[PDB]
């Protein structure tokens, strides 16, 4: 089982990942390793004979994802071809499958560590010719017999006896019938036909076709098939269209290092000849050991004794003179690499020109990438293994193909201009071709002898050919005549590539170079022309295929960063972790120019340890542009301002498509040299110009730069334009979600002047009444970051559950933005007024105490209303709710039509969805640590009594035990609060776990809320002993506390208490008569399905000094009239909320008809059927004025005097919530049109008409046709009346009220019986997308049902 199983995770660097990523790489690591083992076993194993060559291995990497860490080139060099099963590369020799790239350097090290028996690593003939392999091998007959000694198939079929197992698909019989003769090497089959030693054979290919394609002079093929067949087969594929077999023999480009394992040549430091600067640093004129460190094959990077080899790049060190390494590195040195290998005359002018081209291209200055001197200080030749993507466009058809480097290198026979962005990799790609044509590591270019690389922007329209050649490629080395230099192009007709750079700004090319690019009838030379995307139309009329330099793949950038920051690798891991969740920013690295900017910023400004790296990237790109274009500083500033104005026009209109009119309106000229970096003129369909920038996010950063240079400018017109474009950010959602990265880009510049302006604008976005409808942002700009869609949905959900907490989240992020502005620009002193005014009345969390604004400015804590904390504890929460009864048991006909089946979701389906949600939550948090609050930094450990926050509402998540590290934080932070509220939900036992915490600060409590739990005697004493307590709340308890609750009646300085209870409660009689401390009642909440009340007849219920809330109730039978005759007595009791038949016939006449002191006496849940009792009751209850949430009670025959009741309710000009319950006569329904609502009630917000019986005649109509500017009804919840109405009333309401609007506020729709077919759900979706509530409106129409739907078929 040792060989069957395999582990791909090394535990040496697992704590580092635990520290960085924030979770131990143990659980997910083991799970992933197991899954990889299972599917690796499942997948096919064996010797993949056909695609054994690295050419095909890289050809299978077209579908490979570009977000990786190991480059496809290295993966294929180690033999890891793309199997196609979630990037599961495989050792082609032994089927060692590595599902994921990782550290252990190049894949070879991990290969050896995991399975050291892939015979790949033995050096024997296994069939691993290189990625740039040429099928035509060299002719080395050296045999007895010559060309013509044998003439029979059986004469030479004996040679194929030793046929390798890696070429079994091509049977020896067909090869012998094709004239092929085996030699003895791997597959170097020296054909009987005039040598023809070509061969690299794979199953499925035609030896006849290959023989025709590479040899037209084969006498054997000429005899077997006619010249018609020869010419038919020569057109089978596009390859070496002008190269015979004799060109490769004496080719001026030849091999340098073996490619059997093509890793000892992937590095430029492979051979000694490719290390002239790295080798001959010691001058030959010195009397010292000039060749001490040269002949050993060790590449030296300018460091005194730090020398490394090419055998495996070993760390053989500490010589300083050229002696043996037998001093310090004897053995067992860390990360050993070295021991892994050793222990186990018109043509002669062209020839000289090619030699000098190769010598100049091997030079360090040309070969090294155009990195900044900070980046390119060391030899940047470890990044040469990085290539760019290539795509060929058809002649006229819109069909494009993705070709790898071997494909493109093979297919070079006509004009194919290279296209992209400014410096997007045309120069790098063309230099790479010029260098791989000379380094020998690309046998595909053993044909080319006069590959030419030139920049066409440095050439006058009347220059020559050898003049430019000597002035741009040879320097002073050119002294030969041009008489035969322009004849070598005709003596070497097609094998001449042109790497033309900077052709963009050319219209009249030099005449000497005009006979080779204009007509392809005689020269037919390959063309590789570097053209920006803004100037393709010049050549597009004259192309067969056209190359494009696509996006730099992310793994190339990752590789470059790894090579650079090899010591501080942890920072690169942090960057990778950043871009893993920043999926929107994976494509930000548009260019090796961007990569260079990031590297330079990291090295210089020490921004490596910066939590955000896209901001660093774009700021570094701006710094690069400013440093390079500092001579033309004013033109650069004008271009930046104009292009950022273009971005302001576009993105703020959610547009990225730009034309000549838009660009001219912005202010950019279409003929500026340096505007290409900020504009590319794309030809949209075929001839209509359109404009796209260097990157789609560089445009957003451009907008940021334009905004800061407009707001930080002295011109009043500039300030007005900047403010005009600010004002379009009129929603906090834009600043928090979409333009959040944009505003962070703005803040990246330490703008002293612009920071107060931006801070005032941002903190003015939230006021008493903001235009929240502006949160509906257009989706095209949100398509730039899909994380904006994700976070927008999250903020929207947080909005629908709890607008206060959603506002707290948005305000916390807005304050983080404002403080980032203030501290980055060091403008805290003048931002203090705006920041204080914003923070006044805020309700942020506890983490906001860890920003510097409360250590630098401790006093600011006095302005916040609260700083709440909550810890996500875990427990089984063994509870029994009663939502199952009366709602999951009875009334179960699911009669349906089966055309509306999407309306009803079975409880099984929603339970499955919830289980999946809990599974992803558990995957996230089980690996997570306990996640204690972060109070580590500073401020809290201060001596001189800074301040005391108003409210520290605590609410732990279903926790009953305070850990040793949790209770300490609780008791340390509770002392900071002058009023510690208590929110304890399902915390029956956490009370004594916070008893030590509360003991030191018992008085500072003000409210203790207890929701649906059972208390203990050992903890109830604390609640009874809260001296300066204002409130205590116990609610949602479903069982009477006959003996479990010890004693809750005698507080010390009580101001209010609540013992709310459900089930069959008699709380007006439980907790026996002794109630010593009921002295200063303020706020009590006890719903009671009363069973006994006489215990509290002459008790406190009349002694209420300043009582506010009264959430009482009376439900079934227990002396309702007596209880509410003794309880309706109010002196100043404001809120008397109720949930059922609260009053009675003659026991609601004492003071409610003739008083004012009420606030939130609510009557939503009233329903009784008795007629005469309600008729004889509602003459009383009169009118009030200070009431706020009075709702209408029930009564079947009550309407006759309820009309007068609502008439008196019109005298209540302070209400906000109402019900208008159960009107039946339908002749008093007109009374409540202007009664209370509309005709008065200047600040009514909510109006719920739940479960009415007689909204059929007008009902809905008076609330939808007679509105007439009642603009404060923000919550109109009108549930339908399936047993009280018909149907078409809803349709008429939708047609009239929705169309007329007339209310700038409303609330969403209703449910429980109403569903229709799927065709018009699209209609209602379109209607939702019509009016501006589109991006916020949710239509509730899905009923999560416990019954499986039944079709009435």
């Amino acid at each position: 089982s040792s060989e069957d199983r395999i582990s791909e995770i090394d535990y040496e660097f697992l704590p580092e990942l635990s520290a960085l990523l924030g979770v131990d790489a143990f659980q997910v690591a083991k799970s992933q390793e197991e899954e990889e083992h299972k599917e690796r076993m499942k997948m096919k194993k064996g010797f993949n004979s056909q695609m054994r060559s690295e050419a095909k291995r890289l050809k299978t990497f077209e579908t490979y994802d570009t977000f990786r860490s190991w480059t496809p080139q290295e993966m294929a060099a180690a033999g890891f071809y793309h199997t196609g099963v979630r990037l599961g590369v495989q050792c082609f020799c032994c089927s060692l499958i590595l599902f994921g790239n990782s550290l252990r350097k190049l894949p070879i090290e991990r290969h050896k560590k995991l399975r050291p028996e892939c015979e790949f690593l033995q050096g024997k003939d296994v069939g691993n010719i290189g990625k740039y392999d040429i099928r035509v091998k060299r002719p080395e007959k050296m045999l007895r017999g010559g060309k013509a000694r044998y003439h029979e198939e059986e004469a030479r079929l004996e040679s194929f006896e030793d046929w390798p197992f890696y070429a079994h698909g091509t049977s020896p019989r067909v090869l012998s019938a094709a004239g092929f003769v085996f030699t003895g090497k791997r597959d170097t089959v020296q054909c009987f036909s005039c040598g023809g030693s070509l061969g690299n054979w794979e199953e499925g290919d035609d030896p006849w076709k290959e023989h025709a394609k590479w040899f037209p002079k084969c006498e054997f093929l000429q005899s077997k098939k006619s010249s018609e067949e020869i010419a038919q087969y020569i057109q089978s594929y596009e390859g070496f269209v002008h190269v015979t077999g004799e060109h490769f023999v004496k080719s001026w480009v030849r091999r340098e290092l073996p490619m059997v394992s093509a890793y000892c040549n992937d590095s430029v430091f492979a051979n000694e000849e490719l290390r002239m600067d790295m080798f001959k640093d010691w001058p030959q004129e010195s009397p010292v050991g000039v060749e001490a460190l040269v002949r050993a094959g060790f590449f030296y990077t300018g460091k005194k004794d730090i020398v490394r080899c090419f055998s495996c790049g070993g760390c053989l060190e500490k010589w300083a003179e050229g002696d043996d390494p037998m001093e310090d590195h004897i053995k067992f040195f860390p990360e050993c690499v070295f021991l892994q290998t050793l222990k186990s005359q018109w043509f002669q002018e062209a020839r000289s020109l090619s030699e000098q081209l190769r010598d100049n291209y091997t030079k360090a200055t040309f070969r090294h990438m155009n990195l900044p001197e900070v980046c390119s200080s060391l030899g940047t030749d470890h990044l040469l293994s990085c290539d760019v993507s290539i795509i060929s466009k058809h002649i006229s058809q819109p069909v494009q193909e993705a070709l790898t480097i071997p494909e493109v290198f093979s297919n070079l026979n006509s004009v194919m201009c290279v296209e992209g962005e400014t410096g997007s990799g045309k120069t790098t790609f063309l230099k790479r071709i010029a260098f791989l044509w000379a380094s020998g590591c690309c046998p595909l270019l053993y044909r080319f002898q006069l590959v030419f690389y030139l920049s066409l922007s440095s050439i006058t329209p009347d220059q020559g050919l050898a003049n430019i050649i000597c002035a741009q490629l040879l320097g002073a080395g050119g002294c030969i005549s041009e008489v035969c230099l322009s004849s070598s192009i005709q003596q070497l007709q097609h094998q001449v590539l042109f790497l033309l750079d900077d052709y963009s700004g050319l219209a009249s090319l030099p005449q000497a170079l005009h006979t080779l690019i204009t007509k392809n009838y005689l020269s037919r030379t390959c063309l590789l022309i570097a053209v920006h995307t803004n100037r393709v139309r010049d050549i597009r009329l004259y192309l067969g295929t056209s190359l494009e330099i696509q996006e730099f793949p992310f793994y190339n950038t990752v590789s470059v960063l790894r090579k650079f920051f090899s010591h501080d690798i942890i920072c690169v891991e942090k960057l990778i972790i950043y871009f893993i969740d920043n999926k929107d920013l994976q494509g930000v690295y548009k260019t090796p120019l961007f990569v260079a900017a990031v590297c330079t910023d990291w090295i210089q400004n020490a921004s490596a340890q910066d939590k955000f790296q896209d901001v660093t990237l774009f700021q570094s790109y701006m710094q690069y542009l400013s440093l390079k274009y500092k001579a033309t500083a004013e033109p650069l500033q004008a271009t930046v301002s104009s292009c950022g104005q273009l971005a302001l026009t576009g993105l703020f209109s959610s547009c990225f498509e730009f034309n000549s009119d838009d660009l001219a309106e912005a202010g950019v000229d279409e003929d500026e040299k340096l505007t290409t970096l900020l504009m590319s003129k794309f030809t949209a369909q075929r001839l209509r110009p359109v404009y796209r920038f260097l990157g789609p996010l560089f445009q957003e950063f451009l907008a940021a730069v334009r905004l800061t240079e407009l707001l930080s400018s002295d011109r009043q017109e500039d300030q007005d334009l900047g403010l005009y474009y600010l004002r379009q950010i009129d929603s906090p959602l834009k600043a928090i979600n979409s333009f959040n990265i944009f505003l962070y880009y703005v803040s990246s510049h330490s703008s002293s002047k612009a920071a107060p302006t931006v801070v005032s604008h941002l903190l003015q976005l939230v006021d008493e009444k903001e235009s929240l409808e502006n949160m509906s942002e257009n989706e095209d700009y949100m398509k730039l970051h899909p994380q904006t869609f994700l976070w927008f949905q999250f903020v929207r959900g947080l909005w629908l559950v709890s607008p206060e907490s959603s506002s707290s989240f948005v305000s916390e992020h807005l304050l983080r933005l404002a403080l980032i502005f203030a501290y980055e620009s060091n403008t805290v002193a003048e931002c203090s007024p705006f920041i204080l005014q914003f923070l006044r009345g805020k309700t942020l969390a506890l983490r906001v105490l860890n920003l510097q604004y409360f250590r630098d400015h401790p006093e600011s804590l006095l302005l916040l209303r609260s700083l709440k904390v909550s810890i996500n504890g875990n427990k089984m929460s063994s509870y029994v709710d009663y939502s199952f009864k009366t709602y999951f048991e009875n009334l179960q006909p699911p009669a349906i039509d089966e055309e509306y089946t999407s309306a009803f979701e079975h409880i099984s389906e929603w339970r499955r969805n919830f289980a999946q949600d809990e599974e992803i939550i558990k995957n996230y948090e089980n690996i997570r640590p306990r996640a204690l609050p972060d109070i580590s930094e500073g401020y809290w450990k201060l001596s001189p009594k800074p301040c005391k926050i108003p409210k520290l509402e605590v609410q732990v998540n279903n926790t009953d035990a305070a850990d040793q590290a949790l209770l300490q934080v609780l008791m340390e932070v509770f002392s900071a609060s002058q009023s510690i509220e208590f929110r304890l939900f399902n915390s029956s036992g956490f009370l004594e776990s916070i008893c030590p915490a509360l003991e030191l600060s018992k008085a500072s409590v003000t409210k203790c809320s207890m929701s649906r739990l059972e208390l203990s005697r050992a903890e109830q004493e604390l609640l009874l002993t809260l001296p300066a307590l204002q409130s205590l709340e116990v609610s949602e308890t479903n069982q009477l506390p006959e003996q479990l609750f010890h004693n809750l009646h005698k507080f010390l300085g009580l101001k209010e208490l609540c013992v709310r209870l459900d089930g069959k409660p008699n709380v007006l009689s439980v907790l026996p008569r002794e109630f010593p401390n009921l002295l200063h009642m303020e706020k009590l909440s006890i719903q009671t399905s009363t069973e006994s009340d006489l215990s509290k007849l002459v008790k406190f219920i009349q002694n209420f000094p300043n009582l506010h809330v009264f959430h009482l109730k009376c439900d079934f039978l227990s002396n309702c009239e007596s209880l509410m005759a003794v309880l309706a007595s109010c002196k100043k009791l404001r809120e008397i909320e109720f949930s059922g038949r609260c009053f009675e016939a003659m026991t609601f006449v004492n003071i409610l008809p003739n008083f004012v002191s009420l606030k939130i006496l609510n009557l939503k849940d009233q329903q009784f059927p008795d007629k005469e009792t309600s008729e004889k009751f509602a003459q009383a209850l009169g009118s009030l004025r200070n009431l706020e949430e009075l709702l209408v009670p029930t009564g079947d025959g009550i309407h006759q005097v309820a009309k007068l009741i609502v008439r008196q309710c019109l005298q209540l000009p302070c209400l906000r919530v109402l019900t208008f319950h159960d009107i039946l006569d339908d002749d008093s329904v007109i009374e409540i049109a202007r009664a209370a609502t509309s005709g008065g009630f200047q600040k009514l917000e909510n109006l719920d008409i739940s479960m009415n019986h007689k909204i059929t005649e007008e009902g809905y109509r008076n609330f939808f046709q007679a509105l007439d500017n009642l603009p404060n009804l923000q919550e109109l919840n009108i549930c339908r009346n399936i047993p009280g109405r018909i149907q078409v009333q809803a349709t008429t309401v939708k047609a009239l009220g929705q169309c007329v609007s007339r209310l700038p506020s409303l609330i969403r729709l209703h449910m429980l019986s109403w569903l229709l077919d799927e065709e018009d759900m699209k209609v209602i979706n379109d209607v939702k997308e019509r009016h501006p509530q589109s991006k916020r409106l949710i239509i509730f129409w899905k009923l999560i049902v416990p019954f499986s739907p039944v079709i009435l078929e």
Partner: protein, 86 residues
């Protein structure tokens, strides 16, 4: 100290941490999914529908919450898988 660097910027790891922790209400309704189904009454003509919609309206609101939160967290659990995958 933090006068030239935006150190207070949420790293999109801590942003998800407060996404999970500083949520609106937590698990006051998510647990009804497990509670309701496991492995006399007073249901009258009017005592059968007690405005059960809001319970389902709240259920759908917090289902949207859970969908959004687990989308943010299914953009973050793959962090652990892909970082080992590098």
């Amino acid at each position: 100290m933090a006068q030239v660097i935006n150190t207070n910027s949420l790293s999109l790891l801590t942003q998800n941490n407060l996404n999970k922790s500083q949520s609106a209400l937590g698990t006051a309704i998510e647990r009804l999914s497990s509670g309701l189904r496991i492995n006399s009454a007073r249901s009258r003509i009017e005592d059968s529908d007690y405005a059960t919609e809001v319970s389902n309206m709240s259920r759908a609101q917090i289902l949207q919450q859970a969908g959004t939160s687990v989308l943010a967290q299914a953009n973050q659990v793959p962090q652990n898988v892909l970082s080992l995958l590098r």
